[PDB]
Amino acid sequence: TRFNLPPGKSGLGETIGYLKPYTATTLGDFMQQHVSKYGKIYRSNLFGEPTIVSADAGLNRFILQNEGRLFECSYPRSIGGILGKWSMLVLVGDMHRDMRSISLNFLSHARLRTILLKDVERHTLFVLDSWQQNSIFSAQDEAKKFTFNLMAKHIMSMDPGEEETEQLKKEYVTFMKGVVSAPLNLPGTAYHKALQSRATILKFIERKMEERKLDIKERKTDDDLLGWVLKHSNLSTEQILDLILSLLFAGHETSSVAIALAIFFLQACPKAVEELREEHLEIARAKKELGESELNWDDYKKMDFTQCVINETLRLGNVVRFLHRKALKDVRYKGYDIPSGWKVLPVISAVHLDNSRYDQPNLFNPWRWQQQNNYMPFGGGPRLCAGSELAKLEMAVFIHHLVLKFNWELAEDDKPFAFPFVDFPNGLLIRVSRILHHH
Ligand code: HEM
Ligand SMILES: CC(C)CCC[C@@H](C)[C@H]1CC[C@H]2[C@@H]3CC=C4C[C@@H](O)CC[C@]4(C)[C@H]3CC[C@]12C
Ligand SMILES: [Cl-]
């Protein structure tokens, strides 16, 4: 083959072993064994392609920052099949840049600080005020309701707990299993089921688009993303559809996982919950003195220990395990040959769990962040998560009201696994009890 390729078993495929589920607060047996035997940069045959796998933090940074120059986003076909050819995980170059710009304006700082913050709180309370005490229920399911409803409101003005919002959410439950499965469009497979849901979702959104276009004729309307792209962009119908469909997927499957992880880590770390309660009680009490009832951006900026808990939740729990890229030309990195056209997987989660970068890396220790290259849960470079500031705001507002209203406990054993999407197999069943006297 090539003398300076990274070592490996095989440049004979290893996809099944690579994808075998593992405990989400580790890298799993397959990755650990390959790194122990071959080193942090190794070769394999994965997803049908010769592949370089990187658990090396410096190479991962280099890959992400040289997007569009030496490396390019290159996901398996199931992603583009389900999220669409105009989604941001498929688009490259100028079209990707323009889609990203639209996304950034809509999670733009100004809109985020004002209108979005206020909806985030209202949706947090819609969920928390429905919870019954001393009754087993799935925290993972409730977190996805919160974040999906919030996105449906922001993108298409859909109201939470209305029938059409609940039915739309049910369609999204098929997506993640389809995205990670073989792209066999055959009756009964997970990919076929997600494509059927895609068809249903697309029909729903395009009907709402046609209604909104009539509304804009009769001058009734651009306060949500759908209205915005209709009036202020020249995207085509299909481009709008994939933008909306894929942002609702992000609303189902990203920050909801993070919130479920936080609820799990925190019930095993009561000292962190006590310190969160002090922080949030002080914010609430100050607001009550002023007569304020809604959070504002200045309140959010006070949530310093909450940010420590958010950073630690993302570091330990690793919502995203690795990203898909390909080499755009031959790259020779510290002696290793990365040939043109090969797949390249930056395992962004690896640096988070490296005991030479983080003391006791498998421990939930939010104080490692307090008053404090090694942290990339949102990716990096020109594809750095465009929702990251909304994701942190959702987590923080949800924790704010969670710790003020309730104590909680696990109803049974559970722990998160990576499939590679992160999921609590037993649903993170909890019970809550209402706090009647704060300290
Ligand atoms: C803790 C929660 C989240 C995590 C860990 C996360 C992680 C990521 C990662 C790793 C990527 C890069 C994918 C790649 O480059 O291959 C990404 C991209 C993206 N994410 Fe997030 N995300 C989260 C929440 C959100 C939310 C709430 C939204 C709201 C829509 C969002 C929207 C986006 C968008 C639009 C991109 C594409 C950026 C681009 O291609 O330029 N994400 N996310
Ligand atoms: C497209 C825009 C709207 C943003 C999407 C953000 C979220 C949904 C993206 C960012 C990182 C993505 C993950 C990155 C890598 C992989 C591994 C691949 O083998 C299966 C899909 C999976 C697990 C992706 C699932 C979707 C994901 C979590
Ligand atoms: Cl050779």
- Is the CB–ligand 2 distance for residue 320 below 6 Å? yes
Structure tokens at 240: 């709008």
Q: Which amino acid belongs to residue 48? A: G
Nearest to 287 by CA among 302, 276, 275: 302
Instruction: Classify residue 115 by its DSSP letter.
Output: I
Residue type, 33: Q
- Tokens 């690896």 — which residue? 350
Give the DSSP H/E element, type plus range, for residue 128: helix 117-128
Question: Rounded distance, CA 297 to CA 282, Å?
Answer: 16
Residue 256: which of 166, 387, 105 has the closest Cα?
387
Q: Is 68 exposed, middle or buried (0-12, 13-18, 19+ CB in 10 A)?
A: middle
Residue 437 · residue 405 · CB < 8 Å: no
Q: How far is the C-alpha of 342 from the C-alpha of 351, rounded, in Å?
A: 23
Determine contact, residues 325/72, Cβ cutoff 8 Å. yes
Which DSSP state fits 366?
G
- Find the Cα–Cα–Cα–Cα dihedral 422, 103, 233, 222, rounded to 10°: 90
From ligand 3's centre to the CA of 339, what distance in Å? 12
**How much distance in Å is there from the Cα of 261 to the middle of ligand 3?**
46
Q: Is the CB of 247 under 6 A from ligand 2?
A: yes
250 lines ligand 2 (CB under 6 A): yes
- Is 308 annotated to bind a ligand? Reply is no
SS3 435: coil
Is residue 288 within 8 A of residue 282, CB to CB? The reply is: no
Cβ–Cβ contacts within 10 Å for residue 334, how many? 9
Q: Where are the alpha helices (DSSP H) in 157-254?
A: 163-172, 175-179, 190-217, 225-232, 237-253
Q: Is the CB of 349 under 6 A from ligand 2?
A: no
Question: The tokens of 45 are what?
Answer: 């045959």
**How far apart, in whole angstroms, are the C-alpha atoms of residue 38 and residue 55?**
11
In 3-state terms the chain splits into helix, strand, coil percentages (rounded to 5) of 55, 10, 35
Q: Taking Cα atoms as reference points, which of 65, 70, 61, 67 lies closest to residue 93?
A: 67
Resolution, given in Å to one decimal, reads 1.8
Quick check: bond before 420 cis, omega within 30?
yes
CB neighbour burial string for 4-19, b if at least 16 within 10 angstroms, e if fewer? ebbebeebeebbebbb
For residue 9, report the distance from its CA to the centre of ligand 2, in Å. Answer: 27
Where are the extended beta strands (E) located within 263-349? 325-327, 331-333, 336-338, 343-346
**Helix residue spans in 6-116 (DSSP H):** 15-19, 29-38, 57-65, 77-83, 93-106, 109-111
* Deposited experimental method: X-ray
Q: Name the residue ranges covered by the structural domains of the chain.
A: 1-439
